[PDB]
Amino acid sequence: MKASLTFSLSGIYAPCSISRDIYLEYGDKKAECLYGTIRLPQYGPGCTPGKIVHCVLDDSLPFCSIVVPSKLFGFMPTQPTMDFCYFEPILDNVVPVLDSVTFLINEQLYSKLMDLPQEMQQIQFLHYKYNINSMETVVHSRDILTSGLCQILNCSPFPQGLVDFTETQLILVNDTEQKLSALKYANEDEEYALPKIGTNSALSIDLESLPCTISRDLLRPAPHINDDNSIYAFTDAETLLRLDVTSGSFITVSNMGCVRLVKLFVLLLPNGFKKRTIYAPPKIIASFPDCSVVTISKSNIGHTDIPIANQVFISRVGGWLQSQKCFQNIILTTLKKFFSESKRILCQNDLIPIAFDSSMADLNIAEENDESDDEDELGQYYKNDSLVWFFVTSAELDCFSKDNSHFIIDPNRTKLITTNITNRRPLPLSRSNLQRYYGFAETFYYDLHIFPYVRQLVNILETSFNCSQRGITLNASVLLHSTTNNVGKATMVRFASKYLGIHLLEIDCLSLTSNSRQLDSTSKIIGYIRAKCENVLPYASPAVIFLAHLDSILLDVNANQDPEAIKLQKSINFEMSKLLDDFTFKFPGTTFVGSVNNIDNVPSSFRSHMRFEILVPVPSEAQRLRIFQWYLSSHELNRDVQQKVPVSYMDNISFSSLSSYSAGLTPLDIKSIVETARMTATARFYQESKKCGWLPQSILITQEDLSKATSKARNEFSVSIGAPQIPNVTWDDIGGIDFVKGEILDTIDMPLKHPELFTSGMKKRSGILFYGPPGTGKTLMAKAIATNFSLNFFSVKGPELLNMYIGESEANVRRVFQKAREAKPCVIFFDQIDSVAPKRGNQGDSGGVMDRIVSQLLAELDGMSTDADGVFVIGATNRPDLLDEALLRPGRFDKLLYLGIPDTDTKQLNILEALTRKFVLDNDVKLIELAKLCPFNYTGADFYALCSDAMLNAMSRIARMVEKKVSQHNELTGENISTRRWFDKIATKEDTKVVVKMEDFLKAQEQLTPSVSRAELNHYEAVRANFEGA
Amino acid sequence: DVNANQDPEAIKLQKSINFEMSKLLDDFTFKFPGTTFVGSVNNIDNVPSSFRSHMRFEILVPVPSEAQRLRIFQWYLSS
Amino acid sequence: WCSFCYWYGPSLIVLDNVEALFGKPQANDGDPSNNGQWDNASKLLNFFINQVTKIFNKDNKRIRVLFSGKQKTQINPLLFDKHFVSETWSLRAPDKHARAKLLEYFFSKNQIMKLNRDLQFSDLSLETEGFSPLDLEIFTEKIFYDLQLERDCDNVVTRELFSKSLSAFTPSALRGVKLTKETNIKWGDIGALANAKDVLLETLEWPTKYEPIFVNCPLRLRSGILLYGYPGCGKTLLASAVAQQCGLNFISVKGPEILNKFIGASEQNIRELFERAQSVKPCILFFDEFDSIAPKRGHDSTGVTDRVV
Amino acid sequence: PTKYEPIFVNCPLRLRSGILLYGYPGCGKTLLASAVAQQCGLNFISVKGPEILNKFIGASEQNIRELFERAQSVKPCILFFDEFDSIAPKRGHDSTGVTDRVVNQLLTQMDGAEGLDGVYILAATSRPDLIDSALLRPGRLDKSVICNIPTESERLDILQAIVNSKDKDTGQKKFALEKNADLKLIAEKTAGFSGADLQGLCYNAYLKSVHRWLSAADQSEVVPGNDNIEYFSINEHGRREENRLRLKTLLQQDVVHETKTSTSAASELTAVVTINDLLEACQETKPSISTSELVKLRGIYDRFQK
Ligand SMILES: Nc1ncnc2c1ncn2[C@@H]1O[C@H](COP(=O)(O)OP(=O)(O)OP(=O)(O)O)[C@@H](O)[C@H]1O
C-alpha cells in the first residue's frame, strides 16, 4: 500500500500511530494495537527490509497519512521530513517472539544496574526508565536506544520480534571501551553559525559522483517529464541555503571553461552518503577530470537562455563496441530514441552517455518508432547492459553567441548530423564508479595492498601511460599465464584498465571464424584480427589490446606435422610478430596484453620476443577473505533477482570459517558456492511460504547451508580432477587416540595455520606413518582427515602402481605423485608400504622391479628442496621391519606414530561412545555398565564388531516382532498381503527408532571373541619392541 | 557396424543411411497397406541392433540334413 | 537461439543427443593436436557458454538450458569445469510396480489385443526383469504378432504362448548377442543341506525384506561369509543357487584364474573385476580356492602371494 | 675454468671429468650436489631416479643420448645422477632382462672419444658396491669421495651452521637461536647419527618453543586480568560462558595496519629456542642401527690399498 509519511518528536520507545482509515480498511476490534509494516523509500539498489511497528490508533490523521518517531532512526525533525512511504498490514498480526536478545550499555549505568542484586528491580527499571512493556514492545537487532546509553546489540536468530522475559533472556554487555561516545545515532549536530560558513558569494566543496541511481519518482519537487529531464544535482545540508538559491534552483558554476547548468536538490533525509559533499550523476563529472574541489555560487539564470540551435553535429567516441556492424543499427536506433523522447539543453565540450542492452543485438524491431507514437516501450523488458559516449560536438547557433550552454534541438525545426568520430579518455575509476551506478555486469574491485600481481601489472600500464604522456614512448607489453585453469586472467586486465582510466580492446581468439584449418587461411584469420583491431586506433585514447586464449592459435611444432602444418605454424608466428611490432610504430604507447594456458605450449620464437612475464597464482587465504566479502555483498546478490523481497546475510557469518574451509578453491568456485547457498535459502523461503508463517520479510543466507555447500563444491571439483569421493568421518567419529591426535594437530594444523607467527621454517615435517596391529583405526584416521579438514585426498591403494610392461614407474607413480604437486595442497595416502617398498637389500630376481619402484619413489619424494607445497604423505603399515631404509629418519616419511591396545580403564568406553555416535540407547543402562561388563583383551574394531552383532540381534528382535505383528494382522485384516501394501499401510513412529534396551549386549559378549589372540599379539609386540631399531 | 577405425564423417553417413532405411521401412507400412518386408543377411552380427529391433521374426536357416538331401537329389535327378 | 529465447521471456532450451553438437571427439587416447589444443566442438561450446552466461548474469529467470545425453561423465568435461551443470537425474531403470502399469498401457496401445486370460501381469513381470520401456514396446508387439497366427482366432493371450516368446526373442538390447548360459538351480531348489542356510538367508534377504530398518541404524552393512569347505564340496551349488535369488547382478570369478606368473597379475585382474563389480549394481561376487589365493605369508615368505594379497 | 683459466692455457692432458659421491647413510651429499650449483654459478641438469628407462625398447638409448645431447648443448652445466644405484648395477647376462644396454651406452659416452665435455659427471649413491669395476676407473669416473658421520665437534659445527639460519638478508637468525649459544652441552648430550636428525631435533624444539609461547600468551594476560565477562545476572538458562563466542564474534570489530612488535625474540612474535627444550629430546633422538654397513664399506676401503 501507498501511505503518506510524517516524523513525530520521538520517544524511540513510544509507539508509531495507525490512522483510523487504515484501521477501517484493515479494521479489527480484536487487535486495536494493530502492528503495521512500513517500507522506507531510500537511496540504494532497493528498499531495505521493512519495519514492523507497534502503533496506537489515531483518528486525526488525514487520508492515508501515518506518523513515526524521528529519533527512532537517528534523524531529527529539523531535517526535511519525507512525505510518503509504503505500508503493509501484518496478516492477523502474526509475529513470533524472539528467542534471544542482547543489549549493550555504558559501564556506569551497567554497574549501577548490576549493583542491584534482585534482577526484578532491573526488569522494573526497564519500565520506569525505558517504558518497555512485554508483548506490546517489538525490538530490533542492532538499534541504538539512546546516544551514549542503552543499545540493542543483537536479536537472534530473527532480526525482529516480540519479547517476554518469560522466554527472553535479556543479555547485557558492558561497554568498557566507551565506544558509545562515538556510537551516537544523531545524524545532525547544530552548527556554531550559519553566517561565516564560507561566503554566499563563493563556496568550495569536493564534488562526488552519486554512488547510486536516482529517479524522478523519489525527488521531492515535480519536474516535467518531456523537458527538465536527465540532469540533476544533490546537496547535503544548510549548504542548500548558503547558495542563497534553495533546493529546486538551478546553478551553473564550473571550475574551468564553460558553465554547466544543473538542477540542485537537497538529499532525501534517509541518506547514508557522507555530508560536506556535492553529489552528481556521472554525466556531469565526466566533463571535469580531477579538480575535485569545485567552485560554487548562486549563479542563477532566468529559465532557458537559448530556445533553439537549428542543427547539431554530434560525434561518437571511439571504443571497443562502438565500431561493429552488429551494433551499428542498435546504436543509431537507441540514439534516435534517446534524443527524440525528451528535450534537453546541450553544449559543445560536453559528453552524453548512452546505455543499452547488448543482448538486443541481432533483433531488429520493425514498427515501434517513426511510424508510431512517441511513448513506445517498457524498458523493464527492453533492458540495459552496456554504455557509450557521444560527444555533443558543433551546433548551429543563431545570432546569439558565447552562451552556448543552452543549445536545444526542436524535433521538427532541427536535425542531428554525424561527424564520424572524436577522441576522448574515460574517467578514472578511483574517483567514480560507472558500473555500480548503472547496475551492469560487475568488475571485482582489487586493492593493491594484497594482490602482488595486480600491483605489478598496474605499475606497468601506469608507466606506459605516463612515460608517453611525457616525451618517452614505451613499447610495453606483457603475457599473463597460470598453472591452473580459471584464474581471473581477463578480470585483472579489465580492472587495471578501469583503475587507470585506460582504454582497451576486448577480443577473444576462440571465436575466430576459422580453426587452424588445413587449407591455408591463416591469412584470412590474422587479417580479420588486424582488420577488427585497427578501426578504433585512429581515434583511440591511450589503450591496450587484450587477447584471450592466444594458446588456441599459437599452436606449437611437432606431434605429427604435415608440410602445411609447418607452413601454417611459421606463417602464424611470422604474421603475429609483424602485426605486433608494426603496431608499436603504427601507434605509440599501445600495449599488447596476451593470455595463455600452457607456457610450455607457446612457440619458442614468440616466447623470446615477448617482454614482461607475470605468473598469477591460485589466491591465498588472505585474499579469499576479500573474495567472499565481494560476492556475499548486498549489491552482488540483489542484482540477479526479480522479486521485490531482498536478500542479505546474517551478520553472524564467520569470514574466518569460509576462508579456511574454502582453501584451494578458485574464485569461480567461490561464486558457485555462494550462488548455491542463495538457491538453498530461497527453497527454504518458499517452503516457509506454505503456511501463513513467519519471517516473510526477507530470506537471509545462514552459516549452516553455506558451510554445507562447500562439500558439494569440493565434490564437483573432484569429479573434474581426481574422481574418488570419500564418505564422511567427522572428528568425534573417532576417539581414544589422544596422543596421536596431539601429534597430528602438531603436524597438520598448527604449522599449517598461523604462518603470521609460525616462522614457516625452511624445511617441514613431511608426513605421518602409522604402524601396528590391524583394526586400530589406522585406515580410519585417513578418511577422517579427508572429512574434517579442507585437504583433498589423492591416494594409491597399495600396489596400484606396479604394471605389466617394463619401465613401470612412469606409467603410474610419477604421473600421480607429480599430480599431487600439480594439485593444490593435498595429501597422498598410502597403505601397505611393506608391500610397495621392499627393503632394497633383500634383492629380488625376475627383473628386480621393487628396486625400480623404490628408487623412483624416493627420488620423487625426498629432498623436497624448493618444494614445500603441502604434499603431506601419510599412511599405514602392518609390520615396519619390511619397510625400506626409505624409513631411516631423514624426515622424508619417518614421523613414526604407534597405535595399539588401549588403556584398560575407560578408553574402551571412549571407543564404545565414539562408535555410539548417532547410535541410540534410552534407559538406565549407562555406557559405564557396558564398558565394565566387557572383559579386557577385546580391542579396537572388535568392539565395533560387538556393536555390529548386538545391532544385528536387535534388528532380528524387531524383525521377529514384525513377523508376529504382521501374522496377527493377516489373521484379522488384509488376508492376502505380504510387503509393499503392508509397509505402506502401517505408520509406525514409536517403534521405528528400534532402540535396543539391553540383552543384545550380553549375547554379543557371549558370541564375540577377540579377533587377534595374545599368541597373535606377540608377533606384533616383537616389532613393537624393536622400536624400529632402538 | 560403427567402429573406432573409421572417420566419424563416414560413420554419420552410415547413420543417415540406417535412419532413412528404417523410416522408409515403416513408410511403406504407412503409404502402402499390407506391404511385407523380407531381409537377408549373411552374418547377423554386422547389422546393428538399431535396425534389428524392427524385425518381427528371424529364422536361422541351417545346412540341410539327410532327409532333406534325399529329397534334393531326387529333384536334380528327376528327368 | 539465444536471441529468440531472450525476447520470448522466461524460456527453456532443449538440446538432445548433445554428443553431436557438443560431445568430445571420443576422448581419443594419445594427444596429437589434443594435448594443448582443442577440437572445434569445444570451440562451439565455449562460445555458447560465454554468450548465455552474459545473459544469465542479467536475469536468473530469463533462460535455462536442458541437456539430454548418454552418461554424465562422457560429455565434454569443459561443460563441468566452468560450473555449467548443477544436477544429475539419471533414469536408472523401470521398477517392479510401475512396469506392470506400463506393460498394460502397451498392451492397450494400438491394434487392441484386449488383455489376457486370468493373469494381471504381476507374475508376468518374472522374465522382464532387465528390460526397458522400448523393450517392452517391442516385446508387446512381438507377443501380439506371434499370437495372431498361432491361433486362427484372435485376442486371447495364453500363459504358454507368452512364455515361449521370452525363451528366444531375448530383446536384451544392452546385452549384445548373448551373455548367459547357467540356469540350473533355483533359489527354492535346496540341493544339499539347509544346516546353516539360515545365516546365509539372514544376510541375503533382510536388506530386501526389512529394507528401511537398516537405514535408521548407522551400521556399516554387515556382510562377508566364508564357507568351511572341508569336503571340497558345496559352494559351487550353494552360491549359484543364492545368485538365483535373481534380485542381484551376479558376476563370475574363480581363484586359480588369477595366478598369472607375470609380475603385474594382481592389477588388470582384481581391480578390473571389482571395477566391473562397480559397473554392475552392487551384488554378490564369488571366490574360491583361498588355500591358493591367501597363504599366511606372516612376513616370513613375502612372495608374489603378497603382491596379490 | 674460473680460477685456473690463466694457468690452463693448454693443459696437455684432458681435464678430470667427474665425481661420484657415496655414503653409508642416506647421502647427505645429495644436498651438497644441489648446493654446488649456486655455490659455483653453473647450470644444473638432473637424472632424477631411473627416469632414463622406458617401456619401449627403442626409446631407452634415444632417451639417454638426448640427455647427453642436452648436456653438451648447455655447455656450462652440472649433469647429476640422483641415484646411480638405480641404473648402473654390475654387468651380467641380462641381470636386467631387457634394455640393460643403457649401461653400455653410458660406458660408451661417459668419455668415449670427446673426453672433456666441459660439463662434468656428478652422481650420488648409497650402496655403490653394486656398481662394478667395468665403470669405475680413473680414465673413466673415479674420484669416489666417502662421506661419514660428523663425529664430535662436527656435530657442533653443523648445528651452528643450521642455527645461524641466515637467509634473504632478513630476519637473519630465522631460528631464534639460544641467547647464550650454550651448544657445547646440548650437542654431545645428544648422540648424533646424521645431520637431518639434528635438524629435526632443532626444528621440533622450535615447535615446542612456539607451543610454550602460544599456550602462555593469552593466559599470561588472563591471569592478572580476565576480559569480556559480560555478566548480566543470568537466569533461566546457563549460557553464562557459552555466550562468549557469539559475543566475541560481534563485540570485536577493530582493524589495524602496519603493526609492529619488539619484545619478541628478534623476529615478529617468534619464540626463542632454549637448551632445555633440546636436552629433553636427547632421548627423542632415535637411532636406526645399521653399523654393519661400515663392514659393507670395508669392501671398497679394502680395494683402497691404503
Ligand atoms: N577474483 C575474481 N573476482 C571476481 N570474479 C572473478 C574472479 N576470478 C574469476 N572471476 C570470475 O570468473 C570469470 C573469469 O574469467 P577469465 O576470462 O578471467 O577466466 P576463465 O575464463 O575462467 O579462464 P581462461 O581464460 O584461463 O579459460 C568471470 O566470470 C569472473 O566473474
Ligand SMILES: Nc1ncnc2c1ncn2[C@@H]1O[C@H](COP(=O)(O)OP(=O)(O)OP(=O)(O)O)[C@@H](O)[C@H]1O
Ligand atoms: N575410535 C576408533 N578407534 C578404533 N577403531 C575404531 C574407531 N572408530 C571406528 N573404529 C573401527 O576401526 C576400523 C578401522 O580399523 P583399522 O584401519 O585399524 O583396520 P582395518 O582397516 O580393518 O585394517 P588395516 O589397518 O590393516 O587396513 C573402522 O572401520 C571401525 O570399525
Ligand SMILES: Nc1ncnc2c1ncn2[C@@H]1O[C@H](COP(=O)(O)OP(=O)(O)OP(=O)(O)O)[C@@H](O)[C@H]1O
Ligand atoms: N653429514 C650428513 N649426513 C647425513 N645427513 C646430513 C648431513 N648433513 C646434512 N644432512 C641432512 O641431509 C638432509 C637433506 O637430504 P639429503 O638428500 O642430503 O640426505 P639423505 O636424505 O639422507 O640422502 P639420500 O638422498 O641418499 O636418501 C638435510 O635435512 C640435512 O640436515
Ligand SMILES: Nc1ncnc2c1ncn2[C@@H]1O[C@H](COP(=O)(O)OP(=O)(O)O)[C@@H](O)[C@H]1O
Ligand atoms: N546336493 C549335493 N550333495 C552332494 N554333492 C553334490 C550335490 N550337488 C552337486 N554335488 C557335487 O558337488 C560337486 C560340485 O562342486 P562342489 O561341491 O562345490 O565341489 P568343489 O568344492 O570341488 O567345487 C560336483 O561333484 C557335484 O556333482
Ligand SMILES: [Mg+2]
Ligand atoms: Mg578466462
Ligand SMILES: [Mg+2]
Ligand atoms: Mg585399517
Ligand SMILES: [Mg+2]
Ligand atoms: Mg640424500
